[PDB]
Design a protein around this ligand. Structure first.
Ligand SMILES: OC[C@H]1O[C@@H](Sc2ccc3ccccc3c2)[C@H](O)[C@@H](O)[C@H]1O
Ligand SMILES: OC[C@H]1O[C@@H](Sc2ccc3ccccc3c2)[C@H](O)[C@@H](O)[C@H]1O
Ligand SMILES: [Ca+2]
Ligand SMILES: [Ca+2]
Lengths: 121, 121
């Protein structure tokens, strides 16, 4: 199991200890308050009211938690994922990333606290 | 496991299948949008800006997901709980509830999708 913080201002992402492999079932729970700039903060679902202007993930609100698995595109994580299996051919190290516009990360603040573990399979 | 919706306007809370027994290890994941009345919606964490005007759970924000296990007082769930063990002597059916002020539930809208699973122990 892995546990740590994912900083909203961490553009490159927060590498984890978790290597997702074919057939794996995983659960993720994410918690906390972050911002992409505005003083207000949002949870790991991000800001539902916020237009998308080149977000690193277009399948999640600006300011949501997303991930990458190995070489995959971005994948929404949001509040977490319960007993979850990746699409085909998706595998490798999980990297957790705060969803904002490339280059805009520097005014960001707050972080999420995230747990990830493998489930029975 | 149990999966289901917890309606924001359900002041009595949503009874689940899960009976928490001493020594259980459980995981909950909560997703989605709900409102305690206002036009905006908030996730399972609630509204960090709204003051507590007599909420059924004083340890979570207005609009957060909380629960009752058997005869316990309300316990914060928020976005969820990772491989979590109840406090000494806490046991019984898990009821999921939207955190609002008693009797002010009628103007609530939306819901949370919640998964609960028992973990290996
Ligand atoms: O798209 C994210 C960007 O949003 C702006 S705020 C901001 C607020 C309200 C807005 C309303 C409409 C359009 C853009 C808006 C941008 C952040 O400060 C910036 O760092 C970047 O992350
Ligand atoms: O605190 C829970 C209550 O919040 C109000 S919103 C609202 C907005 C601004 C306010 C300003 C002052 C005092 C209460 C206020 C309540 C809801 O409409 C009501 O149904 C109940 O859930
Ligand atoms: Ca930003
Ligand atoms: Ca209300």
């Amino acid at each position: 199991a892995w546990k740590g913080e994912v900083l909203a201002n961490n553009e490159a992402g927060q590498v984890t200890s978790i290597i997702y492999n074919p057939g794996d079932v995983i659960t993720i729970v994410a918690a906390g308050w972050a911002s992409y700039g505005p003083t207000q903060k949002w949870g790991p679902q991000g800001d539902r009211e916020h237009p998308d202007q080149g977000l690193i993930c277009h399948d999640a609100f600006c300011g949501a938690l997303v991930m990458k698995i190995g070489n995959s595109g971005t994948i929404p994580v949001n509040t977490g994922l319960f007993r979850w299996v990746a699409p085909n051919n998706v595998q490798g190290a999980i990297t957790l990333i705060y969803n904002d516009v490339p280059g805009t990360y520097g005014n960001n603040s707050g972080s999420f606290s995230v747990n990830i573990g493998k489930d029975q399979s």
